[PDB]
Design a protein around this ligand. Structure first.
Ligand code: B0K
Ligand code: CL
Length: 334
């Protein structure tokens, strides 16, 4: 027999209940705007998939952000546009304002509402324990919405989380790897960055779901509260799972491989070897603490599970005692 199928615990049939036009991005007709309504002001940086620019909308004098995408297949740009349009207005999710093509180069470019040029990886060292609790909850707000909209991000990492620390506003960006979730659909395992890949990707289990983002988020919290970036520092894809096994242990990893009947490489089992589960208190040291708390380690333990179905959902995570005072302070201050 082959690999045992899996289903998302929550938001399983959200795309099934919605009409076909919601998730069938291949059938969607992209309505392009005019690039002449936007002028590039300055350069904000460069990514491995695009080049981000600061721009101005000359029709309403509004500041925007233009993302000139590098050449890519036409089905990926339509998927990202449809996902961004379906997530417009969502909390802590970037707001796609327009989509344009160069009149000569014909290369597509995404236009978003203005967000400051400061990501989470640039501030996680200068933030207190409550500030990482607050921003982690804001990330969960954006993850629960897109999951409830039947959309996996599949590239959660500190660089894709923009922070406007003056205004306490957070935005989850880079939706180029996002994909609609459909029960029983096998997805591509070449998603996310190596340090943030879930074990389902490292063992080539293709029927994953929203819970992949929860693992990536678990690696982000572990990197911050322990001040070790990245937390799982694998040098290749095999070593990434080894680095994970040296922390969670090989016992729960093999019981995860046999649970879904995953066929690993015969030499991969000899590479993983046998490792005991290391308690989270062994990475506390003395400087990176004060960011560590019993509810933090318990919250981290419930995110970094081998079994994707055993991880916490974004909603269940938002109700963990790690955010108890955060949700109490948010409900009275805004
Ligand atoms: N899915 C596309 C999200 C938009 N986006 C992508 N890369 C971005 C960078 Br780098 C910066 Br800086 C800013 Br501001 C934004 Br907005 C970015
Ligand atoms: Cl979820």
């Amino acid at each position: 027999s082959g690999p045992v199928p899996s289903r998302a615990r929550v938001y399983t049939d959200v795309n099934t209940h919605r009409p076909r036009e919601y998730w069938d991005y291949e059938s969607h007709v992209v309505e392009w705007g005019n690039q002449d309504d936007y002028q590039l002001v300055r350069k904000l940086g460069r990514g491995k998939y695009s080049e981000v620019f600061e721009a101005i909308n000359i029709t309403n004098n509004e500041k925007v952000v233009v993302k000139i995408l590098k050449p890519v297949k036409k089905k990926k740009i339509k998927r990202e546009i449809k996902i961004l349009e379906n997530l417009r207005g969502g909390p802590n999710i970037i707001t796609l304002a327009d989509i344009v093509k160069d009149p000569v180069s014909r290369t597509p470019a995404l236009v978003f509402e203005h967000v400051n040029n400061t990501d989470f990886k640039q501030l996680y060292q200068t933030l207190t324990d409550y500030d990482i609790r607050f921003y982690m909850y804001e990330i969960l707000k954006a993850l629960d919405y897109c999951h409830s909209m039947g959309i996996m991000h599949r590239d959660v990492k500190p660089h894709n989380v923009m922070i406007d620390h003056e205004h306490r506003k957070l935005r989850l960006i880079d939706w180029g790897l996002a994909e609609f979730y459909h029960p029983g659909q096998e997805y591509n395992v070449r998603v996310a960055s190596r340090y943030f890949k879930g074990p389902e990707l490292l063992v080539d289990y293709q029927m994953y779901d929203y819970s992949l983002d929860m693992w990536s988020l678990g690696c982000m919290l572990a990197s911050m509260i322990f001040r070790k970036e990245p937390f799982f520092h694998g040098h290749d894809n095999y070593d990434q799972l080894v680095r994970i096994a040296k922390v969670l242990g090989t016992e729960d990893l093999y019981d995860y491989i046999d649970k879904y009947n995953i066929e690993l490489d015969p030499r991969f089992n000899d590479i993983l070897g046998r490792h005991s589960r290391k308690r989270w208190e062994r990475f506390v040291h003395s400087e990176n603490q004060h960011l560590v708390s019993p509810e933090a380690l318990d919250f981290l333990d419930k995110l970094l599970r081998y079994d994707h179905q055993s991880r916490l959902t974004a909603r269940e995570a938002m109700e963990h005692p790690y955010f108890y005072t955060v949700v109490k302070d948010q409900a009275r201050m805004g």
